[PDB]
Amino acid sequence: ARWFPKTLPCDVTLDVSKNHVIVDCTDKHLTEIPGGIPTNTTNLTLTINHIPDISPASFHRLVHLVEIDFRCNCVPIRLGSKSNMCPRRLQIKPRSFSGLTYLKSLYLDGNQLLEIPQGLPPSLQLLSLEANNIFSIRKEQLTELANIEILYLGQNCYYRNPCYVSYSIEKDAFLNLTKLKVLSLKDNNVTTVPTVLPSTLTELYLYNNMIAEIQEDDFNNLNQLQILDLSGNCPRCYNAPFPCTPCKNNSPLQIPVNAFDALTELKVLRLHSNSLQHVPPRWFKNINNLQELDLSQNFLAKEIGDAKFLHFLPNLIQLDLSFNFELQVYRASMNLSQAFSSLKSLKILRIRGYVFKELKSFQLSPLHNLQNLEVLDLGTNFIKIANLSMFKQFKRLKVIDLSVNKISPLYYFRYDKYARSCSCYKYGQTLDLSKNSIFFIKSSDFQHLSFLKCLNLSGNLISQTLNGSEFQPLAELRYLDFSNNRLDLLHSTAFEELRKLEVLDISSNSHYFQSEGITHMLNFTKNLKVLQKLMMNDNDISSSTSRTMESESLRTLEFRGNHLDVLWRDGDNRYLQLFKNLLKLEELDISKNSLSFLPSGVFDGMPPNLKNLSLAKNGLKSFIWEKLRYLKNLETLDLSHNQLTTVPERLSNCSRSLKNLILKNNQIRSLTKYFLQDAFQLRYLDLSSNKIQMIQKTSFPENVLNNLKMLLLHHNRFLCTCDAVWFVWWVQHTEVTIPYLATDVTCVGPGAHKGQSVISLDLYTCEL
């Protein structure tokens, strides 16, 4: 179909709507900028490569460039790879970017640059220089950036990329940048807030620095500021998973009471990890539109009980007061101030790491009349006693998170959560009791909680024989996550009281299935009349008392990580019809079941409307492809990560309906003579990570290839001799999507073509 093959090692996407010709060369092991890049290229990306220098020859013909994303070409030694370390820093010669008069964005992050690149065009609106060795900002170096709007200079002096000296900023360095909206000097060893900053700033990030005190003048002219982040200045270092140095004498970040007076348009204020002991109400005197306030990782345990500053925050949407506990005090109860009732517009409230022994209904009374409250997160508190019926006065809430607690009958601790690199809530009211010490359950525990749509009891100590009476009040429940427990299916009436249950997860409940002679009733699904999805993964199921699983509604069953090779032992025909009576079953995942072979009767004993079947990671050494005729509605068949050596003689003769066939990571050395002859329903074929040497025209007919949405042939043992004249010509001139063509579709031999891509091959010698 194509007259000229695309030999460039980059993915070229055209977007005529926004007029962008995008060339993506991300992680293509390039030591030079490749030749033949389109002249109309607007967005050129060369991220994760080993190009040692940039010169006027680099973007000589690409005058229409609007963005250059030249990131991580010489990433610092500690942040980057150790197998392929950068020998020398990126060298930018003069007049490299001056000729590109249309350049709006330029990312030169992770390149070990010592200074700000000079000679940049006046049309540049965004400049990113993160993870470099630029630790001294001078006014003369910023003169070229007259029209810059976004400027990232962070991660230039911190534990992962040290500079061994304090960050220096000349007085009024950013002042004459009259269009600067976003400025970020995060993770830089900055000692004072740089002044005078331009009034047009909308976002300012000075987090994870050595700023010990804020002056009252530091933000006197930032009347258009929306986001301010002064986190990690005098940090709370208890259990920090990174080198953490707190301020001397355990003092907090000293912020004057009138420091935020000029910030009338402030929406987000992040004071995370600042060792604050008090929050003065005077801070929020002129801040009426504050929507997000993060006060996590401070010493505000006593302040949570008084918190007079909450009366000055009626438009606050998000409030975070996590990990504020007194280092050596295990409180008896949580004391929330009555001022929390004045937070009329609050939707999310997170108070993790408060650390208290007992939660009571009256302790959450300041939160009763907060009509817009959606999320109440009291996780990681080590709560031992909590009457779950107290949440009957919180029916309007979407999520009630009590995860990681001791109730019985990396986000807040990571150094930089916005670091740049080179679920059942949709069902309704969720009550998360995951990672808890609940060992026994009864109907009275879930009393007055009939409104719940999802209950996550994952990671608990429940080692009970459920008989259909432990969740009687949970009538509206649609999702129950019972994973990482010790479910004992002695009675087939387990879970029957949950009549509106659509999804049940009983994965990683292997305990009773590991010991011999224990009764297991897998026929418990018959009583659940509206169950759509069931997961019983990693349960090590090798035996069952019941021979059949019945259900008139189940559409998806995940039986991964079990021992169906033991149940379907050759000669034992008892469990071959285990999934047959699941009449509406469309998806069955029976991967990771040690099935070296499939006995006769497994295909006949499959349900009638089965569409997607996965036999992946089983170690299958043989497969009777002709047996796929029994599976009349088969669309997807996943046989990845197996030891299969051959493909069927004629795939169309094995299955009339098969659309998607995944054979990746197998021992296939050759395809049959007429493999895809008349396979008209086939739309996707994966033969990657195999040992295929030759592919002929008869095996891949054109009428079948043209209907394919994608064909994967990468990581194969292709021999590129004159016998492979058809395959090399077809691959080069086809319009079929074949991923990784110019990076992992390689000739293993003969001699000269070893390690060469098939897309850049020229077999003119085979026709003289």
Added chain:
Amino acid sequence: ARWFPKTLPCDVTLDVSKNHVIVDCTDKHLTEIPGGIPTNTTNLTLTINHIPDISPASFHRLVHLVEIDFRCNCVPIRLGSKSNMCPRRLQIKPRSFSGLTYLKSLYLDGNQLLEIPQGLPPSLQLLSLEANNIFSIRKEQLTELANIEILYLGQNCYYRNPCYVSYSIEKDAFLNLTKLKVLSLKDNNVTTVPTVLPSTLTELYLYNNMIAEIQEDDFNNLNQLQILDLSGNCPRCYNAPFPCTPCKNNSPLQIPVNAFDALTELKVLRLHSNSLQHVPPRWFKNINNLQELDLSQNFLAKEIGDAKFLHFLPNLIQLDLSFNFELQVYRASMNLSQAFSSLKSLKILRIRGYVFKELKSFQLSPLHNLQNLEVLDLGTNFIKIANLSMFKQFKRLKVIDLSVNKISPLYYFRYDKYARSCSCYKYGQTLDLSKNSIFFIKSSDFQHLSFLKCLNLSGNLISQTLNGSEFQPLAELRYLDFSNNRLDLLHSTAFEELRKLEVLDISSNSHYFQSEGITHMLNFTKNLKVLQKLMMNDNDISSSTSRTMESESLRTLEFRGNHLDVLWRDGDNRYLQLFKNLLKLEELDISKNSLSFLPSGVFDGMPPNLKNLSLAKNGLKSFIWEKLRYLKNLETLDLSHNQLTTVPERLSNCSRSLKNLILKNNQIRSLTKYFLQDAFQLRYLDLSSNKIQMIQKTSFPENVLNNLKMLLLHHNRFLCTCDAVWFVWWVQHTEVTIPYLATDVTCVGPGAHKGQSVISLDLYTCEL
């Protein structure tokens, strides 16, 4: 330096003491018996091969053969592999074994033979024909076996190898075999006990058959019988993991009261899975020397309460009454008859699967004065309540097994446990409480059990902050298995009360290490003054409050399955000396820790007496070999299953003490010019499963190679051209142990030599 290379594909071991020249060809993918087998061969083994026939040419010149082990050459379709199924049964032509006048043993198991091979020598003492299609025994066919002593004919007609008809045995078929000591007709569809059997029988096995009734005459002349096994005749099929057909009307195996009268020398009687409801005392009237009695998988729950037959068994050593529960009764208590006190010589008593709610001290009173009692196993009983202090009257016992129970504050079910294929008890008194519902522990729980030397609390629900007061009475404890629990190391005083503790297993206690911000005190080892081995595997440890683990006695630490890549994050120098203060540490396993690279300071921060270190399954892309100089007492270094591409330039310049280096399963394509030059201390090197093409004398000097105990070079990409002239010659003429030489040390190329072994290569063309 051998003069003639050993090209035979079998391991030839010489034993001049017993004149045995052993030739082992087990699993060598042979389609013919290989040529050049030594003439003095006594023991020839050809197990797991595809040799289609045996003829007089097979053992023509091997006249000194005392044993032929020709097993699993045509294994039945259901028992064997499906990728390489046998096309036709093994064909034995006439006069194949008649010429071998010294043949004493002949195993022809798993070959689909239809009849007993005829023309065998008169010197044969053992003949095994298991897993074949011989289901009709005639007297004329056993004429040739006049001097046979051992004869296995089982597994010829069962679910894994059916015959579709009952097993037929002619009357007095084995009677004239006047030397027959062992006879086994197990798993054969046998309907009646064959009569008259020869009086010289010492062992008889008729288990897993259709014998519904025993006649009083069946064993009237077996006065020399020691072992009798009539198990699996009228079996108990509840939760059987194999096709199980019980006798009609739930009737047991009908055994007359005087059936065992002539068995005066009987030592072992196995009546497992016979659906017995009563055990008449009259059975053991003339059996005074019975030592083992297996009555498991029967319906003897009520009989355990009366058991008058135990008065006729004073010399019984082992008694098994497991899985005798009434299918639908959960008893309140265990009722053991007072007749158990008359078992003076009993050492092992197993009563698993009795199924009862509460164990009380007085219920075990019949076992108080049994002075020789060593093992009391009451596992798989679902016991909910049991005062552990009751075992104070059982100090003499070696093991008290209460595994798989509900106590809170494949052997019995496999078809044939003797099927032929093609721990802390040494410390002292063990109390096994594994796989139980114990969620909380205190000193009073282990009161009066100071005598215990090992306590296995593995697989329990303990989610407690141990502070050194939960095991105060356990003063003599040397081993504590606390694996598969939820250990919370809040206090560094955990386990300190166990002062004589030598081994501590806290593996698979990942729960609290998975959630952020939780305090973890790994320095708890300092208080344990005699701890020799500590295992903290699969705990997902990514953070720690303490920076150093201290111990003046710990010799072995297993830290597998953790996140040392997170603790030793580049730039974070805080946990690099975590294992340094473990001064007597000789073994450290830090495999499976996601360590793609080792930061600088890990080697310097290692303990001084570290002998063996494992960095296996880490995904290591690079390794600074020169850093091994810090580890001055290093003998073993295991870097298996990693992504290392190169070996050091000079291994001698890296380590002066390294004896064993394991580099299996890596991406090494070539060795450095002078790799093992002057590395005289090396005694073991593994370079198997790598991509090495060439090995020259400069990289592998002979003075260093000759001192090696073993050198593994299998599964490599060896190119066998004239440049590899030295490697092929050395490998052919060396006495150094290289395993898998004539099976997996193969030439990948060029053309002609593809798939050929290097041992059978002839490079005479490279020297003309």
